Amino acid sequence: STVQTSISVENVLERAGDSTPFSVALESIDAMKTIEEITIAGSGKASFSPLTFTTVGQYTYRVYQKPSQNKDYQADTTVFDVLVYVTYDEDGTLVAKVISRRAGDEEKSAITFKPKRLVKPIPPRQPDFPKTPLPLA
C-alpha cells in the first residue's frame, strides 16, 4: 500500500507580471540529499514532483529558495521545515499529513518566498498612443 504527496510552495514578486525565474529546492534531512529543484517564472504556486511513501513513519525535509540567478534580485533566505507523517487513518487507510513551518518557528506556515528587487526596474519603452478618447478641449 502506498500514498503520495505534493509539497506546494508560493513565490511572490512585488510587481505583477514580473516573470523573472526563481528556483526552489526540496531536501531530505533523513537522507541529507537534495531531492529536487523546481523553477517558477515570476509569481505563482508550484508543487514539487510527488513523493511516494510505501511505509508508515515520519519523514523530514526542508525547502528553501536558491540564490537569484538574476542579480537584480535578492532571493528570500527563509528556510522551511517540512514534516511528512505517514500513518493510517480511522478507517485503516494509508494517509500522509504534511506540516510546514519557518525554521525556528513553532506555528505552522505555508511555504512562501518573496524575492526583493535591489535595483530600479529597467525603463519601459515609450507607451503607444492612447486608445481611449482624449479629454475634450
Query: How many residues are recorded in the chain?
Result: 137
The answer to whether position 8 is within a domain reads: yes
Q: Report the 10 Å Cβ neighbour count for 120.
A: 7
d(CA 25, CA 116): 18
- Are the beta carbons of 11 and 46 closer than 8 angstroms? yes
Kindly state whether residue 36 falls inside one of the protein's structural domains: yes
> What experiment produced this structure?
X-ray
Domain contains 133: no
Question: How far from each other are the two terminal CA atoms of the chain, in whole angstroms?
Answer: 76
What's the grid cell of residue 75? 532571493
Question: Residue 53 and residue 73: Cα distance in Å, rounded?
Answer: 37
Cβ atoms of residues 42 and 17 within 8 Å: yes
Question: d(Cα 113, Cα 11) in Å, to the nearest integer?
Answer: 5
Please count the structural domains in the chain. Answer: 1
- What is the three-class DSSP state of 40? strand
Distance CA 93, CA 14 (A): 42
The resolution in angstroms reads 1.9
Q: What CATH number has the domain bearing residue 95?
A: 2.60.40.3050
Q: How far is CA 55 from CA 2, 18, 24, 88, in A?
A: 7, 42, 27, 10
Segments forming the whole domain that contains residue 15: 1-119
